Amino acid sequence: MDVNPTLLFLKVPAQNAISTTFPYTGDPPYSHGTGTGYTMDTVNRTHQYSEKGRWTTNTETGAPQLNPIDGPLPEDNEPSGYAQTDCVLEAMAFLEESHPGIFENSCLETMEVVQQTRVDKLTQGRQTYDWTLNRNQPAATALANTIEVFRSNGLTANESGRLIDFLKDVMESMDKEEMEITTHFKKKQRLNKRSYLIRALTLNTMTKDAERGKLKRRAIATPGMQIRGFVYFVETLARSICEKLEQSGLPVGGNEKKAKLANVVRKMMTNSQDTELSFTITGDNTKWNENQNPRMFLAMITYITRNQPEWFRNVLSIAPIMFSNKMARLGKGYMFESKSMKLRTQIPAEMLASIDLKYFNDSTRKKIEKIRPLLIDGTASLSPGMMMGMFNMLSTVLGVSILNLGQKRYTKTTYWWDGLQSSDDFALIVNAPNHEGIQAGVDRFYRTCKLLGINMSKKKSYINRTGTFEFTSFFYRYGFVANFSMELPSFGVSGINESADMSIGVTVIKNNMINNDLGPATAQMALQLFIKDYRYTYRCHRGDTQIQTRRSFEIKKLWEQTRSKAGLLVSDGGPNLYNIRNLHIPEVCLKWELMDEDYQGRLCNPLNPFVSHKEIESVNNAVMMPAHGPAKNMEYDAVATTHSWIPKRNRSILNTSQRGILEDEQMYQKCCNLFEKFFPSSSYRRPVGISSMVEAMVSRARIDARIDFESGRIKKEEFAEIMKICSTIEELRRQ
Amino acid sequence: QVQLQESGGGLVQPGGSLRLSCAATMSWYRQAPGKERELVASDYAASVKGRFTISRDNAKNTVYLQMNMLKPEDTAVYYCYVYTLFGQGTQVTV
Amino acid sequence: MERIKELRDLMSQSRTREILTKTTVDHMAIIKKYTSGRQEKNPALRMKWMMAMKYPITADKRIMEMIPERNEQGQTLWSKTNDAGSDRVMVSPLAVTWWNRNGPTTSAVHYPKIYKTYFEKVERLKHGTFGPVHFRNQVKIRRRVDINPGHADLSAKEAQDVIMEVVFPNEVGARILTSESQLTITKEKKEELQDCKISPLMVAYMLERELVRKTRFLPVAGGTSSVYIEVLHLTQGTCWEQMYTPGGE
Amino acid sequence: MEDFVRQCFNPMIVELAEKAMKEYGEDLKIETNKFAAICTHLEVCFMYSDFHFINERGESIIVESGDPNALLKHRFEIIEGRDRTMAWTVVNSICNTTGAEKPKFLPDLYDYKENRFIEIGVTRREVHIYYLEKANKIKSEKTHIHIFSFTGEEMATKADYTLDEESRARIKTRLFTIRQEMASRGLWDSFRQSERGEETIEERFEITGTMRRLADQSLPPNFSSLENFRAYVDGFEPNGYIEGKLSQMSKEVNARIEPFLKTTPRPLRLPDGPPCSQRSKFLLMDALKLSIEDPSHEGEGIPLYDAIKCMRTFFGWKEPNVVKPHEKGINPNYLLAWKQVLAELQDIENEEKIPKTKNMKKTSQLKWALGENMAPEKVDFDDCKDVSDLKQYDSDEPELRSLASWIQSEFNKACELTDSSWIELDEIGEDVAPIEHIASMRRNYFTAEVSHCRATEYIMKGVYINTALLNASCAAMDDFQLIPMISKCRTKEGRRKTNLYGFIIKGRSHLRNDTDVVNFVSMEFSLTDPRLEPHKWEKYCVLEIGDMLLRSAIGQVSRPMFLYVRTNGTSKIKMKWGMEMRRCLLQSLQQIESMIEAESSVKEKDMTKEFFENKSETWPIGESPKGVEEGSIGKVCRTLLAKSVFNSLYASPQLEGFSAESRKLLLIVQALRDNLEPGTFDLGGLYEAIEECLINDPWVLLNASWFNSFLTHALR
RNA sequence: GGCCUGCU
RNA sequence: AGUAGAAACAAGGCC
């Protein structure tokens, strides 16, 4: 007899055992080298899906741009980006009519937010493409570098501390004859108008790793800092709009998505009488981002912001204006090998414009030949369409408009449709009195989608009777069925620290028990395995064992020293008291009454040199990138113990010409620590104002010395010493 | 910052001459009984043109006023000024 | 005394003097987050990879003057080589366990008073009474429920001023809290935590967690109470219901 | 008017007033009288505060110039002259230290004698109105208020004047100096009334310059300016434009539904080529175990001593010789490496105490076997351009290979029971709730079912091997290291036992990226002759190292005993994911527990015990030539565990792609079997998407064969 | 041969 | 050789 697990589906329905079809117990695919090939392929594919448009050359950037809008209507089922302006404007108008007051309200709240938003909001972001160094750097670092360059060039309106003023300075920089940047190898280099325009309109391309569910790798993009404020405002407007649309599912979580899917299916099927047939289409959109033209987003926003202050319209329109002229950096480059001479070489992507094509294979040779005409200063113009879901929410708005355009008031026919859209994925429930009606409805829905630059993937889509469908790895079969294979990768040690890892693991087990219908015995097994892996990872074994490690000696002496050994934490080699009933309690508090007072005091000592807290945002928040989803943050319950240390940093900056960044880091951190000691609320509430550091610090020294004498340790001798030391630092700052 | 010392006032006959000095724009003003303080000369009132001549030595910070063809109408307390700082005032009686 | 003294020492050197002079208060946050350290994409892989090194964690410089450089057999506990972009020094994990067996001891009696939420959870569970398990299909319907069982009927911003006035009374600014509920909360949490020396930031964070109301969407069947939702994993399942009554009731 | 503040006032005050001007964001060129008025207010604040000191008594000491001493206390300490944030900082600090009441508006000074605030304001109008005006602005105030006015008069409540009168003569002399100096200037046409409390501003975000031209190039094809396009949009109204283009659009743009029937789906085509080879990092079906029967636990013990003791338990060693060559390497190197390992093992046996971890010598043998100094040296392009052989890295579709029957048998025997327990679980909090007791009983049942399973043994082998390899790579980056493959089990009798499959030599492991490869050489004992399925051992070199005698009724077999030696490699990501193989247990048993719960939701009672003991119900878990064979729930547990283990062992992008694109077709087939009239828009596209994932991986090809068999058995 | 780094 | 698979590893750089 030959064993075959798949035959199990002959008795258990597919959805009731779908977890077996998710090989999420092995290493996910990773990219190894350059992503330049993928970037070039994506650029060429985006440009050839809109080949029948019209070509122009921008007078500012001098780059060739392709406009397919209002182009010839498609005559085949292949992907097409020839969106029609009038059709999309009409779709938005019908969306407004079905939801009166949506645009005006959303614009009002967006106007409030834009005129009260601060610059620091831009620091709350992941890697961004700093143009000062032409590389990806943390959002805060890139923002600081750009602000420094602007201030050095004379653009100091951002000193007002307002994001709108920062954007005003950004736009004013576009009209400058010559800017100056700094490079280390420090050298001051001058950038002319066109070079700075291209550096501000460019995107950095990388390869996406840890992407499960496809054989081929893809490319993703990261924009600069000049354009992120406009993107933030536009996405704020789009989120405020989608929050008023029940057909959208992008700005919500997973459980809300499931609830809305259940509600829509029940509404569609229940209202349908015996005569009407119902069919569900589990649709995926092929080349979703490559076929969405930024000009159409400009049209949608300018229709949304009608009868609004002109400044609001301008600030919200700046973003799509820059995306329509966006450029993409090709990537890291290409690495060649010569086996005859036994050597390797790494050529940067910027040489692709001039480098001969003898080194490249046929596929890459043709890709380079096709993309060369669009190469301007080492970057390729990508006007026709978006690169990687930067305007997720606006795309969801367009999809929701398409979904609502079939409310049976615009169809003008017996058939009708509804459903749920989340960018690149949708479920469409279509009802009609007969199979011919369903066919006509789906055909018209597809045709209308093709008029908006949205394509339906026929290969990854199928239609059945309502009651069974899929949506973003959520399988609905007369009710959503748990999978538990999507969350399997999150059952190990997170990698934050000991206490954080313990709390995160127990909380993940608890949550997957609540949401993903994890069984009790399975949860107990998960707890046991997690504890085993945790002890084997942090070298913290039970203590009563003879497992020799680098940490087994101190742990054993602590074990023999303690009297009530049941109170020792698993991190210190103690027994595990966790169970299904204790999954919502931190380890420290669960073992508090069992700890010896000496060990308890040594553990939770504020003066410990290991605990370090930076800001209110990073107290008990851990960023865990979930499998098959975007990066997410979790609140984990933990007590600040000596085990809450933060791990070592990379330390490879020491071998790079960018070595002075570490000295600047140290000096900035010293100044920030001094300010915090002067202003204790610096971390919890970020200080605001327009004065400089030393003014506030010296003046508060004055006052605090005064009052702490009026009652406290200070003495006249010390108070006068502080006053004249303040005068000394004053005259020092003078010179 | 500046202190002003006047000299050379006193009693003179109609048609006579008198020379004021001030040790420190700089100028001379006068105030007659029951009248407002009027400008005389700075370094010229229409009343004193061609009759009174002012001069300034910057080396010694001194502003001389030469008054010729004096009349009863020129009877006043004369004050030196510096740009505003004032001297104590010196009587001129014609 | 000290604080202004390292201030003067910083201003002595030209670079830090320039940083202090030209940098305005508003930019405080930016430069504080200014770092070359990228946020890790795969934390688990490197935590499993770094812990195999010697000196894998980081600690303040003060550790060099509280913990000896080596233990009884000579296993090194800390190194004097500083981190990449900080004055902290890289140290071995043993320096943690050492601190828990011979490090300085204090009076942790006030931690229960600080971490009110967690200890209240423990007390509620310790006095709970279980019941029979009933096996029947559960119709889990998704609903919006409040998870925090100690929220004082305050929002984030609404309680943020209360938290500042409780911890940072001088940086409150214009705000003087009007609602009398906030008055009593301030009085109680002021007299209760009058000398607690854990940290201002952690105290503020835990006060925010305790007082601020927070809500999330979850699949529930029955219950719906704040105390009954924290144990939702233990009382409700796919085909079984476990009757439970927390210690509070 | 600004010429006055150019002339008279000192710098300090003028820049203080200029920063106060910047504070609230209004411009100085439009209205300057406010600047002069508030700078005079600030000046009176200074001149009133300074020159006034106190000593330990009350009765302020007044000195025209502060002498060098600790006695420099200031009688009145200023509030204004600071930012709003700091003004409120001082207010709150004074309130919290003085125990006084917090005012709602900005004071100007604080004093000790009377322990309270002073709000100085000198207005153009007479005092006896401005005083009570600001008084009714401030609610129930105990802070004393004192104001002057240009005429020279002073006033205050309580008839209180807080310090010397010569200072106030100073104030009013300053005041009339101001007055009869504007007399020379002439400003009272507006000085009395120049500020009326104007607060208004319009936000301006103007597109101009280059950024405007970009806006003119981001419009539809037939538009010339953003102004015109916005006007058109504002004037646009729906007039049935979607219908017109829908009618005009070609009818070939359709989404016709192709019915999906029993005869529609065709079997997935498998690639053809040379048979598929073995890819695992260790032997799974052909492993052999040398044991000692020690009482130590899994992690307890020292590796090298245990390995040597286990190997000494076997007698019959022969001089090794080549049996099956690598066919691409230098087998004599493998032979010499094996003999070197034996020699150095003896060398450890001789000395005093077995080292916890041993380093081996870097001979040419393992230099070749571990691929040392073979990475091409990195150079610059400008120095290597004329080399004809210089080209890209080989980037093409992997070699095509057809499925072989060995993977099927390997999976078959990976789901079979064993004579040992390969899982020793940790401790948990004592169960207190009845649901916890049910969970514990279920868990005990599953552990009894799966512990005696080859899948669990493979899990432990992989976890231990990858953990040791990762730790050695991170610790001994430079020097080659010896690691014996160890796994500890427990017999039926209950006696604990150790097992030594072989050895692993780890090489240079300077791993920077998650994809960087660490090469090692693995040696494993076995009895399976490699002359029967050679195509499965394409990358192995197999020697003959001894003879084994296992008790059998046919005299005694005296079988040969071979050594499978190969060069393999891994990476940080692969090591990390292989050291988390225990979650296969989770996956499998979660699936089984979901089955049990779903069935128990029907009958209102827990159904675990009868499922595991009666074994009445069975699921299709394989096909025999007679037909489909069904097994008890325990066999399903073992089968799913083996499937998860093989997923973790043979993981690859092919597996992910095939899994997704075959789950799609499985859902379609399930819809067909449920009588839900399934339909497809392009089924050929889906088939081509599935078939492109099957290239050379044995596991994915076996999964595809299983899928074809399931289709054949289904659709009936 | 000596020393530096391992997400920069 | 080996790992791996649309491009890489099989140490890097600095003296």
Author numbering:
A (entry chain B): 1 to 185, 207 to 756
B (entry chain F): 1 to 24, 33 to 51, 63 to 102, 113 to 123
C (entry chain C): 1 to 249
D (entry chain A): 1 to 716
From the paper:
Central to the replication cycle of influenza viruses is the viral RNA-dependent RNA polymerase which transcribes and replicates the viral RNA genome. The influenza virus RNA-dependent RNA polymerase is a heterotrimeric multifunctional machine composed of polymerase basic 1 (PB1), polymerase basic 2 (PB2) and polymerase acidic (PA) subunits, that catalyzes both primer-independent replication (vRNA to complementary RNA (cRNA) and cRNA to vRNA synthesis) and primer-dependent transcription (vRNA to mRNA synthesis) in the nucleus of infected cells. PB1 houses the polymerase active site, whereas PB2 and PA contain, respectively, cap-binding and endonuclease domains required for transcription initiation by cap-snatching. High-resolution structures of the complete viral polymerase from a number of human, avian and bat influenza A viruses, as well as influenza B, C, and D viruses have been determined. These structures have revealed that the polymerase is a highly flexible macromolecule that can assume a variety of distinct conformations, enabling the polymerase to perform both transcription and replication that require different initiation and termination mechanisms.
Using cryo-EM we determined the structure of 17 polymerase-nanobody complexes at resolutions between 4.5 and 6.7 Å; this is sufficient resolution to accurately position each nanobody bound to the polymerase heterotrimer. The most populous binding site, termed site 1, is on the PA endonuclease with five nanobodies (Nb8198, Nb8199, Nb8200, Nb8203, Nb8209) that bind at an interface formed by the short helix α1 (residues 1–10) and the long helix α6 (170–185).
